[PDB]
Design a protein around this motif. Sequence first.
Motif, short mmCIF file in Angstrom:
data_model
loop_
_atom_site.label_atom_id
_atom_site.label_comp_id
_atom_site.label_asym_id
_atom_site.label_seq_id
_atom_site.Cartn_x
_atom_site.Cartn_y
_atom_site.Cartn_z
N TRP A 242 85.13 -8.87 44.16
CA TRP A 242 83.73 -8.51 44.41
C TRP A 242 82.84 -8.74 43.19
O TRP A 242 81.74 -9.30 43.30
N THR B 163 91.65 -5.54 48.71
CA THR B 163 91.76 -6.78 49.49
C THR B 163 91.52 -8.04 48.67
O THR B 163 90.94 -8.01 47.58
N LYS B 164 92.00 -9.18 49.21
CA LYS B 164 91.82 -10.47 48.56
C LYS B 164 91.63 -11.52 49.66
O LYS B 164 92.12 -11.35 50.76
N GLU B 165 90.86 -12.56 49.36
CA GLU B 165 90.63 -13.66 50.32
C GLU B 165 91.78 -14.65 50.19
O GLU B 165 92.09 -15.13 49.09
N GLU B 166 92.41 -14.92 51.33
CA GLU B 166 93.47 -15.91 51.43
C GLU B 166 93.45 -16.51 52.84
O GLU B 166 93.22 -15.81 53.81
N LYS C 38 90.51 -15.58 55.17
CA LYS C 38 90.18 -14.22 55.58
C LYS C 38 90.63 -13.24 54.52
O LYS C 38 91.29 -13.62 53.58
N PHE C 39 90.32 -11.99 54.75
CA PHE C 39 90.77 -10.94 53.82
C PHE C 39 92.09 -10.34 54.25
O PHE C 39 92.27 -10.05 55.45
N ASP D 28 87.24 -5.69 47.99
CA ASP D 28 87.54 -7.04 47.55
C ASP D 28 87.79 -7.01 46.04
O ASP D 28 86.89 -6.66 45.27
N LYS E 265 82.35 -12.54 42.21
CA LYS E 265 81.46 -13.33 43.08
C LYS E 265 80.01 -13.10 42.68
O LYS E 265 79.22 -14.06 42.58
#
Length: 225
Positions: free
Chosen positions: A197, A25-28, A31-32, A194, A200
Amino acid sequence: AAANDVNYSFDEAVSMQQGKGIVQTKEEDGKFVEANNNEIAKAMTISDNDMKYMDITEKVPMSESEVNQLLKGKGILENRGKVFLEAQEKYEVNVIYLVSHALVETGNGKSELAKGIKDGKKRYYNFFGIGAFDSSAVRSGKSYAEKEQWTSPDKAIIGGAKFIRNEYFENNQLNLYQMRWNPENPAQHQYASDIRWADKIAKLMDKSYKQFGIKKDDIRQTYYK
Ligand SMILES: [Cl-]
Ligand SMILES: [Cl-]
Ligand SMILES: [Cl-]
Ligand SMILES: [Cl-]
Ligand SMILES: [Cl-]
Ligand SMILES: [Cl-]
Ligand SMILES: [Cl-]
Ligand SMILES: [Cl-]
Ligand SMILES: [Cl-]
Protein backbone atom coordinates in the motif's frame (compact mmCIF):
# COMPACT_ATOMS: atom_id res chain seq x y z
CA ALA A 1 6.40 14.83 28.91
CA ALA A 2 7.19 11.52 27.09
CA ALA A 3 7.31 11.96 23.27
CA ASN A 4 9.10 8.66 22.80
CA ASP A 5 7.11 6.55 20.36
CA VAL A 6 9.80 3.90 19.85
CA ASN A 7 8.17 1.07 21.78
CA TYR A 8 9.05 -2.31 20.17
CA SER A 9 11.99 -4.11 18.65
CA PHE A 10 11.63 -4.99 14.99
CA ASP A 11 11.31 -8.66 15.78
CA GLU A 12 8.56 -7.98 18.35
CA ALA A 13 6.64 -5.89 15.81
CA VAL A 14 7.01 -8.52 13.15
CA SER A 15 5.54 -11.16 15.43
CA MET A 16 2.56 -8.86 16.12
CA GLN A 17 1.98 -8.22 12.40
CA GLN A 18 2.02 -12.02 11.92
CA GLY A 19 -0.48 -12.57 14.69
CA LYS A 20 -3.57 -14.74 14.67
CA GLY A 21 -6.25 -13.73 12.24
CA ILE A 22 -4.50 -10.61 10.99
CA VAL A 23 -5.08 -10.01 7.26
CA GLN A 24 -2.06 -8.99 5.31
CA THR A 25 -2.37 -9.24 1.52
CA LYS A 26 -0.24 -9.15 -1.63
CA GLU A 27 -1.06 -8.89 -5.36
CA GLU A 28 -0.29 -12.07 -7.29
CA ASP A 29 -1.70 -13.58 -10.54
CA GLY A 30 -3.98 -10.59 -11.00
CA LYS A 31 -5.62 -10.49 -7.58
CA PHE A 32 -5.03 -10.19 -3.86
CA VAL A 33 -4.04 -13.21 -1.80
CA GLU A 34 -2.83 -13.60 1.81
CA ALA A 35 0.81 -12.68 2.25
CA ASN A 36 2.99 -15.21 4.06
CA ASN A 37 5.04 -14.43 7.15
CA ASN A 38 8.27 -13.90 5.23
CA GLU A 39 6.57 -11.49 2.83
CA ILE A 40 5.11 -9.48 5.75
CA ALA A 41 8.50 -9.26 7.43
CA LYS A 42 10.22 -8.16 4.22
CA ALA A 43 7.55 -5.55 3.48
CA MET A 44 7.94 -3.87 6.84
CA THR A 45 11.74 -3.70 6.68
CA ILE A 46 13.09 -0.17 6.43
CA SER A 47 14.99 0.54 3.20
CA ASP A 48 11.17 5.85 -3.92
CA ASN A 49 13.50 8.60 -2.47
CA ASP A 50 12.16 7.73 0.98
CA MET A 51 8.70 9.13 0.14
CA LYS A 52 7.24 6.34 2.43
CA TYR A 53 9.15 7.93 5.29
CA MET A 54 8.40 11.56 4.56
CA ASP A 55 6.12 13.69 6.74
CA ILE A 56 2.88 14.27 4.76
CA THR A 57 1.32 16.51 7.41
CA GLU A 58 2.67 19.70 5.81
CA LYS A 59 1.47 21.54 2.73
CA VAL A 60 3.16 21.81 -0.64
CA PRO A 61 3.21 24.72 -3.04
CA MET A 62 0.96 23.42 -5.77
CA SER A 63 -1.46 25.71 -7.60
CA GLU A 64 -4.90 24.58 -8.70
CA SER A 65 -3.52 24.53 -12.27
CA GLU A 66 -0.73 22.17 -11.21
CA VAL A 67 -3.06 19.89 -9.27
CA ASN A 68 -5.47 19.74 -12.24
CA GLN A 69 -2.52 18.81 -14.44
CA LEU A 70 -2.04 15.72 -12.21
CA LEU A 71 -5.76 14.93 -12.43
CA LYS A 72 -6.08 15.31 -16.19
CA GLY A 73 -7.39 12.04 -17.57
CA LYS A 74 -8.24 10.71 -14.10
CA GLY A 75 -11.89 9.95 -14.46
CA ILE A 76 -14.17 11.21 -11.66
CA LEU A 77 -11.20 13.09 -10.19
CA GLU A 78 -10.43 15.12 -13.30
CA ASN A 79 -10.86 18.85 -12.81
CA ARG A 80 -11.34 18.54 -9.05
CA GLY A 81 -8.00 20.18 -8.20
CA LYS A 82 -9.58 23.18 -6.54
CA VAL A 83 -11.25 20.86 -4.02
CA PHE A 84 -8.09 18.87 -3.31
CA LEU A 85 -6.45 22.23 -2.47
CA GLU A 86 -9.41 23.24 -0.25
CA ALA A 87 -8.68 20.02 1.62
CA GLN A 88 -4.95 20.72 1.82
CA GLU A 89 -5.45 24.16 3.31
CA LYS A 90 -8.38 23.35 5.61
CA TYR A 91 -6.79 20.26 7.17
CA GLU A 92 -3.03 20.68 6.60
CA VAL A 93 -2.71 17.59 4.40
CA ASN A 94 -0.05 17.35 1.67
CA VAL A 95 -1.99 17.65 -1.56
CA ILE A 96 0.42 15.51 -3.60
CA TYR A 97 -0.09 12.73 -1.07
CA LEU A 98 -3.84 13.25 -1.10
CA VAL A 99 -4.05 13.10 -4.93
CA SER A 100 -1.68 10.06 -5.04
CA HIS A 101 -3.69 8.15 -2.41
CA ALA A 102 -6.96 8.87 -4.27
CA LEU A 103 -5.48 7.79 -7.62
CA VAL A 104 -4.25 4.49 -6.25
CA GLU A 105 -7.52 3.75 -4.43
CA THR A 106 -9.85 4.70 -7.29
CA GLY A 107 -7.82 3.23 -10.14
CA ASN A 108 -6.86 6.55 -11.66
CA GLY A 109 -10.36 7.84 -10.98
CA LYS A 110 -11.83 5.28 -13.36
CA SER A 111 -12.99 2.32 -11.25
CA GLU A 112 -16.66 1.45 -11.05
CA LEU A 113 -16.60 1.82 -7.27
CA ALA A 114 -15.27 5.36 -7.57
CA LYS A 115 -18.66 6.22 -9.08
CA GLY A 116 -20.28 5.60 -5.75
CA ILE A 117 -23.01 3.54 -4.09
CA LYS A 118 -26.68 4.33 -4.36
CA ASP A 119 -29.02 4.52 -1.37
CA GLY A 120 -32.47 6.01 -1.78
CA LYS A 121 -32.18 9.22 -3.74
CA LYS A 122 -28.53 9.76 -2.83
CA ARG A 123 -25.18 8.33 -3.92
CA TYR A 124 -22.24 7.97 -1.56
CA TYR A 125 -18.62 8.40 -2.63
CA ASN A 126 -15.33 7.30 -1.04
CA PHE A 127 -11.97 7.92 -2.61
CA PHE A 128 -9.64 6.76 0.18
CA GLY A 129 -10.78 3.33 1.26
CA ILE A 130 -12.22 4.64 4.50
CA GLY A 131 -14.32 2.15 6.41
CA ALA A 132 -16.70 -0.29 4.87
CA PHE A 133 -17.77 0.68 1.39
CA ASP A 134 -20.06 -1.68 -0.47
CA SER A 135 -23.83 -2.02 -1.06
CA SER A 136 -24.45 -4.12 2.07
CA ALA A 137 -22.64 -1.65 4.33
CA VAL A 138 -24.27 1.37 2.71
CA ARG A 139 -27.79 -0.21 2.82
CA SER A 140 -27.39 -1.13 6.53
CA GLY A 141 -25.92 2.27 7.52
CA LYS A 142 -22.71 0.59 8.76
CA SER A 143 -20.75 2.72 6.24
CA TYR A 144 -18.57 5.63 7.22
CA ALA A 145 -19.18 7.35 3.88
CA GLU A 146 -22.91 7.35 4.62
CA LYS A 147 -22.46 8.36 8.27
CA GLU A 148 -20.48 11.41 7.18
CA GLN A 149 -22.83 12.13 4.25
CA TRP A 150 -20.23 12.00 1.50
CA THR A 151 -22.96 12.55 -1.06
CA SER A 152 -20.75 14.03 -3.80
CA PRO A 153 -17.19 13.63 -5.15
CA ASP A 154 -16.22 16.98 -3.63
CA LYS A 155 -17.58 15.99 -0.23
CA ALA A 156 -15.61 12.71 -0.42
CA ILE A 157 -12.39 14.61 -1.15
CA ILE A 158 -12.81 17.10 1.73
CA GLY A 159 -14.09 14.40 4.02
CA GLY A 160 -11.28 11.99 3.23
CA ALA A 161 -8.72 14.66 4.10
CA LYS A 162 -10.53 15.47 7.31
CA PHE A 163 -10.50 11.82 8.29
CA ILE A 164 -6.82 11.34 7.51
CA ARG A 165 -5.86 14.44 9.50
CA ASN A 166 -8.07 13.70 12.54
CA GLU A 167 -7.66 9.93 12.73
CA TYR A 168 -4.07 9.37 11.52
CA PHE A 169 -2.08 12.63 11.60
CA GLU A 170 -3.44 13.53 15.05
CA ASN A 171 -2.54 9.94 16.16
CA ASN A 172 1.20 10.44 15.41
CA GLN A 173 0.98 8.48 12.15
CA LEU A 174 2.65 11.16 10.05
CA ASN A 175 3.99 9.24 7.04
CA LEU A 176 2.91 6.37 4.89
CA TYR A 177 5.09 3.85 6.77
CA GLN A 178 3.46 4.76 10.10
CA MET A 179 -0.02 4.75 8.56
CA ARG A 180 0.57 1.25 7.25
CA TRP A 181 2.67 -0.40 9.99
CA ASN A 182 1.98 1.76 13.11
CA PRO A 183 5.29 0.87 14.73
CA GLU A 184 4.31 2.70 17.96
CA ASN A 185 1.45 0.14 18.33
CA PRO A 186 2.05 -2.63 15.78
CA ALA A 187 -0.92 -4.29 14.06
CA GLN A 188 -3.43 -1.76 15.39
CA HIS A 189 -4.92 1.20 13.56
CA GLN A 190 -3.32 0.40 10.18
CA TYR A 191 -4.67 1.87 6.98
CA ALA A 192 -4.64 -1.19 4.73
CA SER A 193 -3.95 -4.90 4.37
CA ASP A 194 -1.99 -4.62 1.11
CA ILE A 195 1.67 -5.04 2.11
CA ARG A 196 2.65 -2.67 -0.75
CA TRP A 197 0.00 0.00 0.00
CA ALA A 198 2.68 2.54 0.98
CA ASP A 199 4.89 1.72 -1.97
CA LYS A 200 2.10 2.32 -4.51
CA ILE A 201 1.23 5.74 -3.13
CA ALA A 202 4.92 6.74 -2.63
CA LYS A 203 5.79 5.87 -6.27
CA LEU A 204 3.16 8.29 -7.55
CA MET A 205 4.20 10.92 -5.05
CA ASP A 206 7.83 10.69 -6.14
CA LYS A 207 6.87 11.13 -9.79
CA SER A 208 4.82 14.21 -8.92
CA TYR A 209 7.59 15.65 -6.78
CA LYS A 210 10.07 15.28 -9.63
CA GLN A 211 7.56 16.61 -12.18
CA PHE A 212 7.08 19.93 -10.27
CA GLY A 213 10.40 20.21 -8.45
CA ILE A 214 8.93 20.01 -4.93
CA LYS A 215 11.16 19.97 -1.86
CA LYS A 216 10.78 16.95 0.47
CA ASP A 217 9.70 17.45 4.10
CA ASP A 218 11.31 15.60 7.02
CA ILE A 219 12.33 11.94 6.51
CA ARG A 220 12.27 9.62 9.54
CA GLN A 221 13.96 6.25 9.44
CA THR A 222 14.08 5.14 13.15
CA TYR A 223 10.94 3.32 14.41
CA TYR A 224 12.14 0.33 16.45
CA LYS A 225 14.28 -0.32 19.49
CL1 LIG B 1 -3.58 28.26 -10.66
CL1 LIG C 1 -10.83 22.37 -10.30
CL1 LIG D 1 -17.48 1.85 8.23
CL1 LIG E 1 -2.69 3.52 17.68
CL1 LIG F 1 6.10 -0.14 3.53
CL1 LIG G 1 16.10 11.53 -9.69
CL1 LIG H 1 8.92 23.14 -2.68
CL1 LIG I 1 14.28 1.37 13.14
CL1 LIG J 1 22.70 -0.19 17.75
